[PDB]
Design a protein around this motif. Structure first.
Motif: not given
Ligand code: CA
Ligand code: CA
Ligand code: CA
Ligand code: CA
Ligand code: CA
Ligand code: CA
Lengths: 354, 341, 341, 359
Positions: D282, D272, D27, D270
């Motif tokens: 996130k 989406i 990620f 932090d």
DNA sequence: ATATCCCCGCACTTAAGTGCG
DNA sequence: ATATCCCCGCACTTAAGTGCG
């Protein structure tokens, strides 16, 4: 206090006309073991302790004994008490009761509790001081502990000092353990040594049981209760007095363990892994430990004039502790005899210089 | 519940392979000694009674019995308990420590002691009422002495009432036993219940010893201390607690002895005389008492729920004492299970 | 109630774009194992039972399953449930509650209890019948026990009948055990078989646990609680339902025990005596019992159309219990797949 | 109390020899994923939290964790708990039946149910009386709601007063959160439509799933049935009892969300955004919440002598519930231990330091 | 990567374990 | 010949074992 301790194969007890006859069982390659003939007017023996394999007790001899106020205690293979024949009117139970008053006494309990951990710290420095062959920063701080120990108020406060020092010790001990072993930490997430998953902790855990076994044998061979400790608090199924007695002698298993690592007697086929992921010992490994423990334990030590085995010295100390409780001794000290050994032959040093 | 009685000379208990071999002693004229062979985990005998003169038991035999939880008791010439070999004491020492704390407390101790004698009195009468078939003076007054027990201030005072009634008891007990048996009472030339003499007294002495043995086994079984009894201010290493617990069960012995008197089972043929002019049961006699005690102990009595044997009732009664001591139980009563018609 | 039972080596669950792929494990010496592919628009499976050692599950597959109300229970080696991922909004728990409820209702429970003991008695005959080579007085009667059963208005009352029968069974079984072995009784002085001192009883104890495991594997595979039984009363750490399911299949163990005795395969170094004098099995010995139970259990038997192994019969019979308890089946009979030779 | 959080694609759990090996998912922009190795009977972490898109677990790994009492939880893309993997249930079915027997009885069931919501109210008040530095318009009822709660003759009636107070509580709670975060009401997951995912309502759901996970472990440990709740009725396979036991501890989440908000540790990086214009956390975000939940839960409270952590307290309370049911205990009460409001700090760093340093 | 050692119930005890403080 | 697999306390649970009915 005066007891006759009986070992080996063939412990015979019979009466040849009012004279009680006692044959101690032999353990050697079939030789001449000690014989005893007691007069029915002079017997001094307050009890007989039988940690024996085989032996015949004649009915008349058991009767004679009881009639002469001689206790007969039979120990089991594990040092645990099998049975005892206590005569009516025997100053023997004074010992167990003196022990109980002491436990019930805050001032007393504490003093005896302190007298056990004091010794642990001495033997702990001796272990790590002997790490002269594994000199890479094995530095140990015992007086730091000791001073706090003299001033502790509660029994828990003891465990506090005991523990804090213990953690530091294990970090140093670990410096003598090769990377491969995975001696991660001495205790689990709940601060317990129990249920080992690594080899060294499995070795130490089994080592300590053998030591506890001796402590059980010694205690019972002396008339005290294994379940009432001074430092260790009594609780169901807890041989508390034994756990105390172990503290001044743990050094013996720590040494045996290190001795096995040192040589490299330990193979992977010596261990097995439980469905619960614990690492137990395969009999082959279980023997490798008993054999070294017994050797470290049967080394002799200069104490009270005589030169005697460590196993006898455990008995000697618990005998001492017992007398102290009775007031048949006004001084208690598990710090004596002390331990040490010089550089492991001139060879190990002279050869290393290469 | 079975007991194994051993008498005579040359008794043996050895272990062959894993089986417990028991050879009874030589005592009968031509009728050979009994032989026993017990397989591991397969032994029904609760205890072993050694009343024999000569004998030779092996260490492994003692270990085999202990591991199989089989009590081995040894008596002497007269029939009193010399020693008993019981399996190891409880690993829970809270029980023993509770018992001591209660003994330590002058008042707590006084309350527990009275509860044994309270029961003893109730069962002393119960038997005399069963002995209704021999009516001439079987009327027993507990009440006025039981009231004297309710108000006593010391354990010595309890032993004062204990005796007063004890004397009055055997004074009315005599009526049951024929004139030919020569039983006056249980008291000595000074004050004692030890030294044989009377034919039924010799039968009783042995009885109380068999009961003492079960009492120790039960004391041990729970996790109490045989030596620290509440009532009895006995010797240091004397089974004071067993002597205490004896009292609420003593009636069992009395009844078993009676179950032979009118039963015509007894004869001079099983009672050797002492040179000091006293009496001792011969093997034949001893066997008749060990078996009668065993039948009388195995009599079922309706207790809390189940119709349980008198044997098991001891075990539950001492466990109650232990539960009471640890405050796991809040009321103590040795009268609770009572004897019937 | 439709389940996917996976077992063996290399179990696989993965999502190959919108579809779930299930590759069963292969225990076989490189022989093609089953493969499953499911569409998200159709999956009849209510739960997957993984009695596997090795295998792989993806996060996508776990997620897919849960999002399609497919339960995933993993069983440990001993047959006990290790963990289950239960999807929310799943009928599945209805089984356990039906079982819990049927035990709760007096008559309902005794009705199921009877069927377990009915089947035992039948197979008990089937063994003693088969022991026709050892013909001397091997006669056993079921009809008195079978009819006494029909009217036992209590769980305890059932046991009473089961008992008398088993006692006569082990007398006829002892008629097949050589003297060299030692077989005093099948029960101890407390009327239990636990902690054997002899050989055959040790083999039986160890044998029966292999059957217990089998029952647990099956019970958990069908979604019933192993601890709630109809004949066997729930008590802590008791697998009561397995203890029930053991009775219609104990015959397989007794068969494995006779089979082993016949061969003379049992040598002395197969057993070991403990400090408490129990007789346990050495690895060498255990295998002999394991392998014999294994072969006897894997014996095929023609049931409901297709010849199936006894281990699969056990599964099918609990499947039947589950269905009976949940009204999904009206008739239940553990006697149904009869034994023959 | 430790929680191992795994996110992204390519999560891995396998056992090499006897050691559990964990590999976190991809990620981070360039920053390599975290690797874990655990020695047998030497794992300190309480639970695993899988929040990762892709990845795979072996059965030996699943087994290894179960045998080391390590809970393994899985969450959907929006933070809700899909499933948990707990060790097997108690062999004492007496406790489960004692619970069932209570559930069956109406007067009994109601009494137990009421006690959950009863505690929740007191904790709701504590939270708010702590949000007293942000005094502007914060003011809460509790006592009127506690009285309505006494009167109610049905389980459904309880659920009414639960929400009627919750509504008031959230309108009040809104006064602690800045206008920029855009927090209005709550409404669980009910009607998953446009903007029904406020940037912090989102964070609350996550915390609540972690709390859910904890309660499920505690239940499992005291041998109760998670699927039989007194207050909640729900679906057959729904963790009704977890949702009940959640109530007296929901405050722990609220507090953590509030802390993260007051810290302003939370950043737009932090989160989406969803195609139905909703919000999701996130990895950085999830990490933040898991850590602040752990921090909040590891905070201590004096309870019956010992100064015990909340993670332990949850456990202590479920056991008390279990002993109450089996009649091993007479009184049931979730009100005790009470949450304290003793941390009022500003430019008073001089004495806030001298508080712990002296005592 | 090997194990399984009763199964009547009740009402207990004992010896492992356990989740913390 | 055959074992022994912690030792802070508390307050539990679990599994095994037990003394009957
Ligand atoms: Ca008996
Ligand atoms: Ca007995
Ligand atoms: Ca933790
Ligand atoms: Ca935990
Ligand atoms: Ca078993
Ligand atoms: Ca241990």
């Amino acid at each position: 206090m005066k007891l006759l301790l009986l070992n080996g194969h063939g412990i015979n007890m019979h009466v040849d006309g009012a004279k009680l006859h006692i044959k101690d069982g032999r353990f050697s390659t079939t030789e001449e073991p000690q014989e005893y003939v007691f007069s029915p007017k002079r017997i001094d023996i307050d009890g007989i302790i039988i940690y024996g394999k085989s032996g015949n007790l004649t009915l008349e001899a058991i009767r004679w004994l009881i009639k002469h106020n001689v206790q007969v205690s039979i120990l089991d293979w594990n040092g645990k008490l099998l049975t005892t024949m206590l005569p009516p009117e025997s100053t023997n139970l004074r010992t167990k009761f003196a022990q109980y008053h002491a436990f019930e006494d805050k001032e007393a309990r504490l003093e005896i509790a302190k007298k056990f951990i004091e010794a642990k710290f001495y033997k702990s420095k001796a272990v790590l001081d002997f790490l002269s062959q594994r000199y890479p920063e094995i530095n140990f701080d015992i007086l730091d502990g000791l001073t706090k120990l003299k001033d502790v108020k509660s029994t828990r406060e003891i465990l506090g000092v005991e523990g804090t020092l213990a953690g530091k010790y294990w970090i140093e001990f670990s410096k003598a353990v090769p990377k491969e072993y995975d001696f991660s930490n001495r205790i689990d997430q709940f601060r317990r040594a129990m249920g080992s998953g690594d080899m060294i902790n499995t070795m130490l855990n089994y080592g300590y049981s053998l030591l506890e076994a001796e402590c059980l044998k010694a205690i019972n061979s002396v008339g005290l209760d294994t379940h009432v400790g001074f430092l260790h608090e009594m609780a169901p199924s807890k041989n508390s007095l034994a756990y105390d007695l172990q503290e001044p002698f743990r050094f013996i298993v720590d040494l045996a363990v290190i001795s096995l690592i040192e040589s490299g007697a330990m193979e992977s086929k010596d261990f097995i892994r439980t469905e619960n992921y614990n690492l137990r010992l395969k009999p082959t490994g279980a023997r490798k430990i008993v054999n070294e423990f017994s050797n470290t334990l049967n080394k002799k030590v200069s104490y009270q004039g005589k030169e005697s085995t460590w196993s006898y010295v455990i008995f000697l100390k618990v005998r001492e502790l017992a007398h102290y409780l009775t007031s048949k001794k006004e001084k208690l000290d598990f710090t004596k005899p002390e331990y040490e050994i010089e550089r492991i032959d001139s060879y190990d040093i002279r050869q290393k210089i290469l």
